[PDB]
Each structure stands twice: as structure tokens, then as C-alpha cells.
Design a protein around this nucleic acid. Sequence first.
RNA 1: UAUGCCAGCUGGUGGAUUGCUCGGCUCAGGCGCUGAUGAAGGACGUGCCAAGCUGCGAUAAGCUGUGGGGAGC
RNA 2: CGUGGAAGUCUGUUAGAGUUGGUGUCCUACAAUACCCUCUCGUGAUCUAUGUGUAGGGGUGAAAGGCCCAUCGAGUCCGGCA
RNA 3: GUCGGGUGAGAACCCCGACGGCCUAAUGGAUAAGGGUUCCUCAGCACUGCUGAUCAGCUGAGGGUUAGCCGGUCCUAAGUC
RNA 4: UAGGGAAACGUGAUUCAACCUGGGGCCCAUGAAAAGACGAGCAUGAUGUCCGUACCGAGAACCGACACAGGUGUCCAUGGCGGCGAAAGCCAAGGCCUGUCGGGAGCAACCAACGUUAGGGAAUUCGGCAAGUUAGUCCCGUACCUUCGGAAGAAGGGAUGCC
RNA 5: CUGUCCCAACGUUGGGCCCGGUGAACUGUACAUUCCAGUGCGGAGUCUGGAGACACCCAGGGGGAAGCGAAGACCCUAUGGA
Lengths: 46, 82, 143, 81, 56
Amino acid sequence: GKKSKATKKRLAKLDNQNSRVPAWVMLKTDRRNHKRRHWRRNDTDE
Amino acid sequence: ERVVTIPLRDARAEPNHKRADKAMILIREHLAKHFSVDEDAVRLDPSINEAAWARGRANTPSKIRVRAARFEEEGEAIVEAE
Amino acid sequence: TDLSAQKRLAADVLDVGKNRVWFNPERQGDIADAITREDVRELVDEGAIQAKDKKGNSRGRARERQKKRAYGHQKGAGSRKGKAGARQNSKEDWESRIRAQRTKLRELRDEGTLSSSQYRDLYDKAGGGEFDSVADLERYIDA
Amino acid sequence: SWDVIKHPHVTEKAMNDMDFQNKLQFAVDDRASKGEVADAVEEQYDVTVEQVNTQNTMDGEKKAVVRLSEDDDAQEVASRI
Amino acid sequence: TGAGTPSQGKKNTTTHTKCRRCGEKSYHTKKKVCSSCGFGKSAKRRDYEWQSKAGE
RNA sequence: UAUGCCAGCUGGUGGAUUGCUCGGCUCAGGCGCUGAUGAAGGACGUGCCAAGCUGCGAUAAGCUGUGGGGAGC
RNA sequence: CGUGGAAGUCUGUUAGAGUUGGUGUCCUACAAUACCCUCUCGUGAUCUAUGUGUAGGGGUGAAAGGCCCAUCGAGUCCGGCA
RNA sequence: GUCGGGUGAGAACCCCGACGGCCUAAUGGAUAAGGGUUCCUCAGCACUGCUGAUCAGCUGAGGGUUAGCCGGUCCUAAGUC
RNA sequence: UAGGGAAACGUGAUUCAACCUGGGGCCCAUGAAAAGACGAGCAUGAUGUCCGUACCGAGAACCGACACAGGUGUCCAUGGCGGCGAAAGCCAAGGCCUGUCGGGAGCAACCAACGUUAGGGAAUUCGGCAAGUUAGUCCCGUACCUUCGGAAGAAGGGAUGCC
RNA sequence: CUGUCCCAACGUUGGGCCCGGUGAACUGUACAUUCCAGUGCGGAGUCUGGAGACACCCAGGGGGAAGCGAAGACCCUAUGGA
Ligand SMILES: [Cl-]
Ligand SMILES: [Cl-]
Ligand SMILES: [Mg+2]
Ligand SMILES: [Mg+2]
Ligand SMILES: [Mg+2]
Ligand SMILES: [Mg+2]
Ligand SMILES: [Mg+2]
Ligand SMILES: [Mg+2]
Ligand SMILES: [Mg+2]
Ligand SMILES: [Mg+2]
Ligand SMILES: [Mg+2]
Ligand SMILES: [Mg+2]
Ligand SMILES: [Mg+2]
Ligand SMILES: [Mg+2]
Ligand code: NA
Ligand code: NA
Ligand code: NA
Ligand code: NA
Ligand code: NA
Ligand code: NA
Ligand code: NA
Ligand code: NA
Ligand code: NA
Ligand code: NA
Ligand code: NA
Ligand code: NA
Ligand SMILES: [Sr+2]
Ligand SMILES: [Sr+2]
Ligand SMILES: [Sr+2]
Ligand SMILES: [Sr+2]
Ligand SMILES: [Sr+2]
Ligand SMILES: [Sr+2]
Ligand SMILES: [Sr+2]
Ligand SMILES: [Sr+2]
Ligand SMILES: [Sr+2]
Ligand SMILES: [Sr+2]
Ligand SMILES: [Sr+2]
Ligand SMILES: [Sr+2]
Ligand SMILES: [Sr+2]
Ligand SMILES: [Sr+2]
Ligand SMILES: [Sr+2]
Ligand SMILES: [Sr+2]
Ligand SMILES: [Sr+2]
Ligand SMILES: [Sr+2]
Ligand SMILES: [Sr+2]
Ligand SMILES: [Sr+2]
Ligand SMILES: [Sr+2]
Ligand SMILES: [Sr+2]
Ligand SMILES: [Sr+2]
Ligand SMILES: [Sr+2]
Ligand SMILES: [Sr+2]
């Protein structure tokens, strides 16, 4: 499949949203990424 | 150290297409009994492996001449074909 | 030590398949430190990384058989598997036969042996399939 | 309004292009053309750009590979900034 | 051929995509119409009274 | 007496119960239009380190003025 | 006699399409229609990818009430509705 | 698959060699759709993996896709708006 | 006196996919369109932006809730022996040991797939279901019936290796 | 023509059995070592009378639990539906 520029920006964003909650937020809140999406297990849009 | 003749006729009990694998077990079992050591301690030089797998996995020779040496503190045996 | 990454690089460096590249068992640690392609090329020069020779099927037993068949042997009724017209195409055999017969008659006209009246009579008979071979054509011309 | 050059792209592959091919890599704005990237580099750094190669990265940004002339040295330009 | 599992293998067509107007994955790229907001069909947004209970 | 039955004791498992309420539900009073000066909504951005929410819009958790406020942020 | 090479033509696990029997295997499956062997068609009313059209008392149907996204003697969703 | 060896706290299944096999319209090569980072490197084993794992399509962090002449882009098709 | 190769760094031939160019035949079937190019020269210089580009493409990267024995289009149809063959079987190039749990018991009963069974030979069974028999090629030879096409590979008989 | 049969045998490969590791589901009112008779809503492990019965575990083929699976499609009924 051939992706467009906008489709690429969205996929790019979804990949960034897939990073873990930083180590410092755990210490600041004194103690979970609920939007964890896998390439196989989960499904994106379009 | 001595030269022994290992009979591999008990490899017929195991299915035909897997005779070579059982032949290798039988060699390790024989040398451990006759040299009074553990099966983990017996080391078979690749020459024995190639001798038993010569005609494939199914046609293993009924006998095999083998030269084995015995030494060390815990006790072990290095073995090869001749 | 995991040398599978290097096996991929060596196979591209030597331009040989992954299954044909050999690594020295005594030099595993030196190959484990081989990060780049320049590191691999250096180990190829050192002889540590080598490419095995590719197999080629021996045509010797086929050649002996080709000699026998060219001499007319081993083509008996017990060796034929295909039908007759499958072994030799009839349309192609007629093309071979009639072209040869028309080339003979063309030469005999230029030679002066046959006149444009005798030639026409034979060409039309050849196109009607009156002659089996070129020898059978000559056997008709000579009386 | 949007600026053309966002920040320099400094990675291992970016340094190889700088040391051997005299190329400076930049993370630019995705609406910028090859010509607009060329002009902005010649103005912000005082160099002469020969060729620009753009790629839309899987980061949502546009990566531009900018080749300088022989008069300019990429290693010297990246060291001052 | 079964209408079940073996007919699922042919399903590689893209129809419903992210909509320019509402953002839902309902823009039918073959019909050029959105099944959620009505983009491509109407200037007005697709809303219906049956999307909620009669007295609500 | 093994396998084992019934009740209990100590410890688990589980999360009922009791207590608690940053949420709801309902009633009442007030108030009440926005948009081509491009709304509402959505997308993507925006933080030193930033995934979610909130905010904000390339001037991007914010800029200016007046008033309040006050030693903190 | 040769030439020619016709054909909803024949043999064919060529690719490909189909699915007769085993009422085999499976039947908390590998699988909400699968596995194996056997069997049928295979230059044509052939097979096939992609694009495109026809919509629910309506389509589509070489007709079996077949098919219209595991849903059909009237699809699915939500509403009427407690 | 087997015998040796490598790394490792730990090795039947991670890596090397040898021997022994399997695939030939595919189990090889290039691709469409579709997927969407699954690609590469490093570090890992709590999750995932029909057992184990030092391995991995898994976890985390970095990195990676460069075109006048390959596609899109342009043209018109059934047809659609 | 590019590139590539450790080296040599060939020459002729046959059969010839691709590609080129012709002749014939068929249709109650007649086998796109448009942009564009040609027509219509040469120098020199400049410009040539924008979007895609990773990887999988499958018995683990797609659809089927799964690392699913299912499903899923295209090009490689000219690798060798074999043979009519893009058939079988075997083997290169390439790929793989991941159709991913192992160890042990001459390893019983029982089951799935399967081999061989004397004499008899369908007695089995609703029924030869299952299995088996036959088989490729050449030669000889071939009935009833027929819409004269066919029946037909009728049937039946012989042959078949190697040197 | 032949293991379809007379009439069954031996063998082969994968299971099956033992060990390490992984690890479900169906089902469950209770009690429950049953058997022969009887009785009972006339088809009882549980009632009555007798008989038998030391507990536990392994493998088996499935006699019984009118076994498990599905609020019977048959039939009738409903001022039911299509
Ligand atoms: Cl492309
Ligand atoms: Cl011609
Ligand atoms: Mg990432
Ligand atoms: Mg002919
Ligand atoms: Mg580009
Ligand atoms: Mg279609
Ligand atoms: Mg009917
Ligand atoms: Mg690693
Ligand atoms: Mg798998
Ligand atoms: Mg007999
Ligand atoms: Mg039969
Ligand atoms: Mg009922
Ligand atoms: Mg009825
Ligand atoms: Mg009615
Ligand atoms: Na997905
Ligand atoms: Na950045
Ligand atoms: Na017990
Ligand atoms: Na108000
Ligand atoms: Na954040
Ligand atoms: Na004729
Ligand atoms: Na079938
Ligand atoms: Na309807
Ligand atoms: Na494994
Ligand atoms: Na050949
Ligand atoms: Na039998
Ligand atoms: Na029973
Ligand atoms: Sr999936
Ligand atoms: Sr990145
Ligand atoms: Sr399809
Ligand atoms: Sr419309
Ligand atoms: Sr409305
Ligand atoms: Sr049947
Ligand atoms: Sr099975
Ligand atoms: Sr079934
Ligand atoms: Sr069968
Ligand atoms: Sr046929
Ligand atoms: Sr035909
Ligand atoms: Sr309702
Ligand atoms: Sr490929
Ligand atoms: Sr561990
Ligand atoms: Sr990988
Ligand atoms: Sr590629
Ligand atoms: Sr497949
Ligand atoms: Sr199938
Ligand atoms: Sr090979
Ligand atoms: Sr595994
Ligand atoms: Sr025999
Ligand atoms: Sr009979
Ligand atoms: Sr005969
Ligand atoms: Sr009693
Ligand atoms: Sr049983």
C-alpha cells in the first residue's frame, strides 16, 4: 500500500503515542499507558 | 585405555528413521558402564558421530570399534573411532 | 556469542549465499567483535571468513548416454514413453523433407539438368507428396 | 509565520555525510521546498549550497540533506553552532 | 467454499477511512461519503433522533 | 492408622461488610443565541526531560494593558 | 495418398477451476465448513485480479427460495419499545 | 536431527564447525493489496512465544526511507461527483 | 589504457524465451478512449519543484478473536538428469532444520495411517462400500449399432533391457 | 482382480504407557461400595426386604446414572407469528 503525506503524519503520531510514561512522572505522582497499541494485536485507523 | 566393540543392535527397538540418534545414546551408555563413569562425563569425538551417521539416519552399523581413554580427578572418558 | 548478524554481512561482502559462508571455529571471538563491513572484509583477507564452493551436477553420465543415443542405441520400444508424433513432429518433418526436395530441384534447374517444364512437373508432384526423400526424387528423375 | 530550519539533525549517519561527503543534515518544516531549504542555509550560515535532498521522516518532520561547495567545510560549520 | 473463515481471506479492500470533517474512520473512500457525519453527502451534520431514546 | 469426614485455630485467597465521598440523581432560582471579521467540531502541533488529560496555536500550559492580589511561583 | 489444423473435441493433479465417494481423519477442531485419498473440468456458455454498477418487499438469481460481509420464505443497525 | 565447541548464574532447542536431512511454481527471487515501524543497533526477560531461552516479530531506548529520467503526478475507461 | 575479476579475462556451433517482422483462418461475437509523440535542425547555459521510497508480503508481519494445516493477485514457465511434458522421481542455485516441547519402555491392550498374507475368490454388503486389477510405447487386429461424426485405446494378440 | 468374507496373523510409522516442563474444558441439589426382588406418578445407587461389601490407586472397553449436549423440529394447544 502507498501512503500519503497526511497518512504518514498520523502513523508517525501513533508511533510516538506508543512510547512509555517517563520514569519521572512515576516519582512526581508517587505512583500505566492505557493507549498501548501493537502492530499485530491491535488495529489503527484507515 | 582400551579398544572396545560396541554392539548397536538395540537401536532396532527404536523406529527405523531414528536409528542413528539411539546408536549415539547406546555408545555413551556402554562406555559409561564399562569404564565406570557417568554418562555426562563421556566425550565422543566427532569421528564416532560420522561413523554412525555414515549411511544416513536409518542404516547404522551393527557394531563399532572404539578407542577410549580414562583419566582425571572427577573421572571422565574421551572416546574416538579407529 | 551470536554470529548470525555477521553471517548476513559476510554473505553480501562475498556475494555468496548465507548457507555457503564459513566461519573459523577458533576465531569466533574475533568475528564477534566484527561490527562493520570493513571488519568483515579484513577477516575475509585474514582467511577467517571464507566462501564454500558451489555444486554443479555431473553431466558425465549424461554425456555417455548422449553418445549412445547419437549412435542409435538405448532408444528401443522399452525406452519410449511419449507417443510417436510427440517424439518427432509430423508437420516439422514434412517441412524438413519438402524444403530439401525443393532445394534439390532449384539447384538442378540452375545447373541446366532440368528445364522449366520438367521442373514444374516435379515441383507440383513434390507438393503433392509423391516423393518420400530426396533420394526417392532422384530415383524418379533417372528414368 | 513558520521558520524553514527547525534544528540540525545530528546522528551517526549525519556525521558520516559531514566528514566524508561535505553534507549537513537538517530537520526542516514540512511545507518547505528544496529551493527554500537551500536559501535559508545560505543565509543562516553564509555558505554555498549545491544540492538538497528531502525526505519526510516517520516523525512527522522533513529531513533535508544539504551538500555544500568545495570552498566550504561542513565540519567547520557544524562546530561553531 | 465456506462463507465463514475461507471467505475472510479476500478482505484486503480499503473502504472506511479517517474523515477530513469529523475525524471518525467512516469516510468511504469509494463512495466519497462519510457514514458518521454525512460529509460528502450533506452540508449539514448527520444527526438522527433515533440515536437516543424517544424521551431523551 | 493411610486416602479421608465434621468443627475450630494460625496463615492465605477473595473483597463482602462497616465507616468515608472529589461522582451521580432530582428539584428550584437566574441566564440564554453562535457563524463568511470563517462558527461549533475535528486534525496536527506546542513543555528542558513529556506518553495521557487540561491549556494553548509557529508569539503554541502561553504575549500586552487596566484593576485585584501578594511572596511566592 | 499427402497437405491443412477445425473443435462449447479427447487424455492430462501444466497453471488454474470444481467437489463424486470414503458416509475415512477431525468433530471442547489446525478450522464457527479443516485434512488426506479418490473423482470432474481444464480454448471456453472457460478461469482470474483490480476498478465499477444494481439495495431491502428492493437487488441479483442457467431457479436451489440460491445469494446480498459466519445474518435471508424478506440483510444489518438504532429507534418505535418497558 | 547428532557430536564437538562458543557465550552465559542458567543452554535439547541462542551462536560456530562437522556430519545427517528438508524445500524445486516453492519452503527460492521480485512485488500488489493489506499491515504500520513489525526494519537496524544496543540493553533486557516482568509480559508475549504450545516446553526452555542467554533468542525473538516480545520490553525499553536510540537510529534508519535521499530520485529531472522508478512509481504518483498528466490522460482518458466502465462509471462517479 | 570505464567497470569488474585471484586468474584466464575464449572461439565456433545447434536449439533458440524475450524482442522484431510476415502469411493464413474464424465471427448471427467485429475486438477502448484520450492526453501525448512524430511530422519539424543544431550549440551553449539554466531550470527540473511537490508526494511515495524502511520492513513483511505469509504453515509468525495481510483477512480469519491466535505466531490459525484456512483464505489471499502478479512476474521469474528456459537451472541439470529424466520424459511427450511447466508430469514423477533425483539434484543444483537459493532457503531451511520454526509445518517449533522434550526424555524413556522390542515400545503390551486399543486407535490412526499402511505393508505382506496360504488355500478359496464377493461366500462379505442394501450395494464390490473399501481395496485391488489394468496401465507408458510400437506392431497386428477390432464387433453390435450409427445422426456416418462416432462406436474405438472396443475386445483380443505380440513386442519392450544392456552391449 | 482382490483380506469384503471364510478367519484371522505378523510387520511398519504416529499415538497410546512411564518421566521433565506447560496446562485447559465439559460437568457438579445433596448423599453415594453396590446387587437381586419388591414398592412408588406404572422405567429406584438413596424407599421396603434380603444378599453382598476392608480402604486407596493404575490401565481398559463403555452395561447403568431413563449419562452429557439443545426450554422437542414430531403431535396438540394459543381468539401466537410469518
Ligand atoms: Cl512505487
Ligand atoms: Cl508465410
Ligand atoms: Mg519507536
Ligand atoms: Mg498433423
Ligand atoms: Mg522525495
Ligand atoms: Mg467485480
Ligand atoms: Mg420447494
Ligand atoms: Mg540481542
Ligand atoms: Mg507457527
Ligand atoms: Mg489369500
Ligand atoms: Mg470403489
Ligand atoms: Mg417444548
Ligand atoms: Mg408441522
Ligand atoms: Mg398469519
Ligand atoms: Na494490525
Ligand atoms: Na525534532
Ligand atoms: Na487418593
Ligand atoms: Na445563560
Ligand atoms: Na505529556
Ligand atoms: Na483432407
Ligand atoms: Na474432496
Ligand atoms: Na426487507
Ligand atoms: Na524450540
Ligand atoms: Na530439461
Ligand atoms: Na490387510
Ligand atoms: Na458406561
Ligand atoms: Sr491480526
Ligand atoms: Sr525515531
Ligand atoms: Sr477480492
Ligand atoms: Sr451526494
Ligand atoms: Sr437531523
Ligand atoms: Sr454420502
Ligand atoms: Sr487430525
Ligand atoms: Sr464437520
Ligand atoms: Sr481410504
Ligand atoms: Sr480433461
Ligand atoms: Sr475443451
Ligand atoms: Sr426496543
Ligand atoms: Sr519476496
Ligand atoms: Sr528468568
Ligand atoms: Sr529481526
Ligand atoms: Sr525495498
Ligand atoms: Sr498459503
Ligand atoms: Sr479448503
Ligand atoms: Sr542447496
Ligand atoms: Sr518453541
Ligand atoms: Sr516378503
Ligand atoms: Sr455379490
Ligand atoms: Sr495388450
Ligand atoms: Sr436398604
Ligand atoms: Sr477410556
